[PDB]
Amino acid sequence: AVTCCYNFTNRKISVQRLASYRRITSSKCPKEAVIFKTIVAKEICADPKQKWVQDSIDHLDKQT
């Protein structure tokens, strides 16, 4: 039931294809990660430290 991130994409995603996004919170998970959900219902692992991830987060937030 629980899925985690073991690798982060070092490649930015067009904010035009990112539906939602949640943060990893489960204790069964080993890495702190931001999971982006695309407009095609696909999830991808990202790194919070990275600026494009953060900024992409300021957009997803200031739109709801």
Binding site: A1, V2, T3, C4, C5, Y6, N7, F8, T9, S26, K28, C29, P30, K31, I35, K42, E43, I44, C45
Partner: protein, 371 residues
């Protein structure tokens, strides 16, 4: 036979000046033969075959005698099935030991025993000269030489030139991968006619087209799901192979390459071995990985590592050695007839390979490249 794979325990404690050998002969210490030369004389004279006790594994292949009429050179050459990735330019040096010998002929021969061994790589050819000699006897010679680990791998070619087709003639290459693990690559001379008779040593790239594992897209097709417990086993042991049966799992590739959320797993089985109830020699499993500590993005230190574990039988029970560093570990599978190689999913990203060595079988699993 003229070829095969063997294993034995290596207790340095009960090996004459064992510690000293491993220190000056198998470790890149002094830049001169003197130290090791003087230790071998003491030891090898009391026992001319002592060095065989230092190999945890021995992999031998039968090579045809190629002759050189013009010069009277009987030559044997071969490509050893190196167990793991040698290293990275960032690694240090390995001090390998080379042994050339033959059976002592009951009839005093014309000339004195002679052998010129040279290990060639695409660029440089390391030729064991006289200045490399650390021991000599009527029918045996030992050389010592430091080589950048990255060079010791597939590609390196071994060539031994004699003046006669000595009986029982063979060359050995002792390669220490870890302070406590030594692998011996041996070349046995067979008749000119005979065709090369290798050992059951295979090399398998587990993640061909690593791009395929960049995401969870093919997970379902590959049969790598929380359901099957991320297990997609393939057989490694051929149809004629020994009474033991080894297999590999390719699902870890996802955990090494995926940027898609994957099933949380306590561990991951990289491979399993069946038929321990009948096996009588230890089982070794070496792992090649990169250190976890991160480095300066401006200068990524790619230093490769190796730790070898060993599953042995004590009074019928099999147990595994262990390392507080080693990313993998050996555990008994279902019963005491099955052995498992495990690892934490978080270790995968830095795992380069693993090699399974047991009586009559050797497998080199690579988690990179496509060949």
């Amino acid at each position: 036979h003229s070829s095969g794979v063997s294993t034995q325990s290596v207790d340095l404690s009960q090996i004459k000046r064992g510690d000293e050998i491993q220190a000056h002969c198998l470790t890149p210490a002094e830049t001169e033969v003197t130290e090791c030369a003087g230790i071998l004389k003491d030891v090898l004279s009391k026992n001319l075959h002592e060095l065989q006790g230092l190999c945890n594994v021995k992999n031998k292949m039968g090579v045809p005698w190629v002759s050189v009429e013009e010069l009277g050179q009987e030559i044997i050459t071969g490509r050893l099935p190196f167990p793991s990735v040698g290293g990275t330019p960032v690694n240090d040096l390995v001090r390998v030991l080379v042994v050339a010998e033959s059976n002592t002929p009951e009839e005093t021969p014309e000339e004195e025993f002679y052998a010129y061994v040279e290990l060639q790589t695409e660029l440089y050819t390391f030729g064991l000269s006289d200045d490399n000699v650390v021991f000599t006897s009527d029918y045996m010679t030992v050389w010592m030489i430091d080589i950048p680990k990255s060079y010791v791998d597939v590609g390196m070619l071994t060539r031994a030139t004699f003046l006669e087709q000595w009986p029982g003639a063979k060359v050995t290459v002792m390669i220490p991968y870890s302070s406590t693990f030594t692998w011996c690559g041996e070349l046995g001379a067979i008749s000119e006619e005979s065709a090369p008779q290798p050992s059951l040593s295979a090399r398998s790239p587990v993640c061909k087209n690593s791009a395929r594992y960049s995401t969870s897209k093919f997970c379902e097709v590959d049969g790598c799901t929380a359901e099957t417990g991320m297990e997609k086993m393939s057989l490694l042991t051929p149809f004629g192979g020994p009474p033991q049966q080894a297999k590999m799992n390719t699902c870890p590739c996802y955990y090494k390459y995926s940027v898609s959320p994957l099933p949380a797993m306590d561990h991951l089985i990289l491979a399993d071995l069946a038929g321990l109830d009948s096996l009588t020699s230890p089982v070794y499993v070496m792992a090649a990985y990169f250190d976890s500590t991160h480095e300066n993005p401006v200068r990524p230190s790619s230093k490769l590592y190796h730790c070898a574990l060993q599953m042995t039988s004590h009074d019928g029970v099999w147990t595994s050695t262990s390392s507080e560093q080693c990313p993998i570990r050996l555990v008994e599978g279902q019963s005491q007839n099955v052995l498992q190689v495990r690892v934490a999913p978080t270790s995968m990203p830095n795992l380069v390979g693993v090699s399974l060595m047991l009586e009559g079988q050797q497998y080199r699993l690579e988690y990179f490249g496509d060949h």
